[PDB]
């Protein structure tokens, strides 16, 4: 029963490791998405105008 407590603490901490190593903060990735999507739209629009030249 002692051993289980030890193993459980390591377990929780190891799972914290997996999350912090792999799982992103969706808020900031969403910010990145919005910036990149805007730049896509800006790109397309200026090619429309570049075609006019």
């Amino acid at each position: 029963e002692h051993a289980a407590k030890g193993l459980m603490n390591a377990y929780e901490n190891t799972q914290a490791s997996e999350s912090r190593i792999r799982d992103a903060d969706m808020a900031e990735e969403t910010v990145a998405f919005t910036k990149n999507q805007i730049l896509v739209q800006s790109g397309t629009a200026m090619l429309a105008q570049a075609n006019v030249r």
Binding site: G6, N9, A10, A16, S17, R20
Partner: protein, 159 residues
Amino acid sequence: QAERNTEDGMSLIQTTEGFLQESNDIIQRIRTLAIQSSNGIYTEEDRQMIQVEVSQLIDEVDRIASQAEFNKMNLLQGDFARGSRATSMWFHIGPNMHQRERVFIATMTARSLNLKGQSGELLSLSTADKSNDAIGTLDAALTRISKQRANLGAYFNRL
């Protein structure tokens, strides 16, 4: 990436701590047992039964220290202050160079006076020490490891 390194460090540090929570509950249990053992009318035969419980708890400590790994690094056995190399837990906290920290730690049964057995007839070759010092020793064991945990705790908050 420095933020990530800081956070990956936080978990490594917590992993070490979990093994040390295990380590301290062991001392607290051995302390409970030492108090029973210190009873001069509690017999030598019955003390051997206690030493069964204590001896294995001591071995469990040495095993925790030996096998307590994270990312295949051994975080508690005597590979600190040096192993084949002194290379240890560097975390790179800022984006530039000279924004660095190292962490070291060590425990094994030889962290405190590793008392086994008790006066009288035994099947071992070891005996416990002055009951008063045995209590003092277990306080020392708890002090040394809890103090090491305090190191990790504080370190976590720094990160």
